[PDB]
Design a binder for this molecule. Structure first.
Ligand SMILES: [Ca+2]
Ligand SMILES: [Ca+2]
Ligand SMILES: [Ca+2]
Ligand SMILES: [Ca+2]
Ligand SMILES: [Ca+2]
Ligand SMILES: [Ca+2]
Ligand SMILES: [Ca+2]
Ligand SMILES: [Ca+2]
Ligand SMILES: [Ca+2]
Ligand SMILES: [Ca+2]
Ligand SMILES: [Ca+2]
Ligand SMILES: [Ca+2]
Ligand SMILES: [Ca+2]
Ligand SMILES: [Ca+2]
Ligand SMILES: [Ca+2]
Ligand SMILES: [Cl-]
Ligand code: NA
Lengths: 313, 323
């Protein structure tokens, strides 16, 4: 058994070794002994030169195709001569070169993340793969500079690596509903090869804002003979959240006396306060009506205002 | 009349607890008005009857004013800090009207209550400690110390309780995740939130909180053994069973469902010579073995789950070809 080692991906014609020098054959006899490479059903990776005795690269030796992520890659063959018939075995170690970049399986990663997630939350990212071996395989990841996430690179027990985002500062949908990052995967080649993966973070609104009335106090004057349906006031609150979280419902507050709901009506959607019953100047000249605004989100915080309805003779 | 008023208010001013029984004596308006009990009967003393309920009546003979209907401060005045019922008294001969007023004082006749009989949260075991979860608010319609004061949470190993006070003085509780959940160990957690007022004793309401822990893919497959050995006759035909490899995964559903494949850790030709069932882990002969060509095949097999960020497990099958 003769042993050679070459880099993968050598050009056709690249010299591997010499049968005169290594197998002790006589150069003048090669044609007569019909020296040949035996390849079997495998590819004709190697051929021999009768004029020089040199064995050489005759087809593409791609270590990734041949041996995947095996730490070592060996191609075997035989040489046969006749007169007399002899078979010689040789093995060629095919050494890795850094001819591949890392790559991510997708062109981008999209994430949806609630602004309500506490710092400390971790999010594993899409892994990169590099088909080379040893130092030429994936080494680490880097993350673009940003205001929210730190990067941790974790090594699994089988030696493979993935990146994790670690939320360091809370997201804020009101301030920045979209965050763009770039994850770079690097191999450990010299020079290093890399790939990038854009990460598109969509921040999801949470109900972290209470309604707020445009004013705390509304004042109205209404003739005591005003008929049912008479518009008294329209209150208005706004909410910074989106959707249900920002959608406001008006109601009578708990800070009201019995009677308010029979004397007044309130549109829960429009905040319009109307006369429902009959006012009476001599009975009550001033009504104090507390109104609450709540959103349709989780854990709604109430906003409150007061409407002072002055009854006019 | 010489003294019907003090600092702008009627002197016919009484203060009683809410929810007194009918007939409960409030005061004597004749003694306080200084009316002549002598000719009282001629004056037909009575409470003026308006549209509102007759909460009080007066004995026209004695002047005694008493509770005549239920006085529920919660209905009357909601969460207003003070509750005054006003009324008028009339006498004839001559006709006169007097204002009167009765302060209705709160008693702690209500528990807090929750708007639902239960609450559910679904929480991933992958959520970080420090995460907070708002819980349903309780309401107590009494006032002052008789209204909602605090919340307590059942003893548990994962969550602390915080009680927050909003700008309007209402209070809610939130769970705070203090120790990570773990689906593999406890896939659900049951808690009880108690709302308490500040009465003596404190009145309370409870809210069952049922937490479903959501599984995360935080376990890699693990092979039963790292190395499998087989001896196969070189004339073994296609379909010949070589080995069955087996990995297990502690996670739930897809996160724990295992797929077997040939590892990247293999030489070209492994897929042509062998076959591997991706579900059962059964390795079979596919091509033709040849003892003179190759005496020993090293096959690496990978197990990966169907969850997020799968971590592969690996094993090796040594197939010895028998002449
Ligand atoms: Ca290559
Ligand atoms: Ca390579
Ligand atoms: Ca590489
Ligand atoms: Ca926000
Ligand atoms: Ca928000
Ligand atoms: Ca809101
Ligand atoms: Ca009038
Ligand atoms: Ca009138
Ligand atoms: Ca009038
Ligand atoms: Ca009551
Ligand atoms: Ca109470
Ligand atoms: Ca009460
Ligand atoms: Ca777990
Ligand atoms: Ca799990
Ligand atoms: Ca798993
Ligand atoms: Cl050439
Ligand atoms: Na006076």
């Amino acid at each position: 058994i003769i042993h050679y080692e070459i880099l993968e991906e050598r050009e056709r014609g690249f010299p591997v070794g010499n049968v005169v020098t290594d197998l002790g054959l006589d150069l003048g006899s090669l044609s007569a002994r019909r020296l040949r490479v035996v390849s079997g059903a495998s590819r004709r990776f190697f051929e021999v030169n009768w004029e020089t005795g040199e064995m050489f690269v005759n087809d593409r030796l791609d270590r990734e195709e041949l041996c995947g992520t095996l730490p070592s890659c060996t191609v075997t063959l035989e040489l046969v001569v006749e007169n007399p018939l002899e078979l010689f075995s040789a093995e060629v170690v095919v050494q890795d070169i850094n001819d591949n970049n890392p790559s991510f399986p997708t062109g981008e990663m999209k994430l949806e993340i609630s602004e309500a997630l506490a710092p400390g939350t971790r999010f594993p990212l899409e892994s990169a793969h590099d088909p080379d071996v040893g130092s030429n395989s994936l080494q680490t990841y880097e993350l673009s500079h940003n205001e929210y996430f730190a990067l941790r690179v974790q090594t699994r027990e089988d030696g493979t690596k993935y990146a994790e985002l670690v939320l360091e500062r809370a997201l804020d949908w009101e301030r920045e509903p979209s965050v763009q990052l770039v994850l770079t995967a690097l191999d450990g080649g010299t020079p290093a090869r890399s790939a990038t993966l854009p990460i598109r973070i969509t921040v999801l609104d949470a109900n972290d804002n209470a309604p707020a009335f445009n004013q705390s106090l509304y004042r109205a004057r209404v003739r005591e003979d005003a008929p049912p349906g008479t518009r008294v006031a329209q209150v208005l609150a706004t909410d910074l959240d989106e959707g249900l979280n920002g959608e406001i419902v008006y109601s009578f507050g708990s800070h009201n006396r019995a009677g308010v709901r029979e004397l007044f009506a309130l549109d829960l959607v429009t905040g319009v306060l109307t006369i429902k019953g009959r006012l009476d100047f001599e009975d009550t000249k001033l009504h104090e009506i507390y109104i609450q605004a709540k959103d349709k989100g989780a854990n709604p915080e109430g906003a409150h205002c007061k409407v002072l309805v002055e009854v006019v003779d």
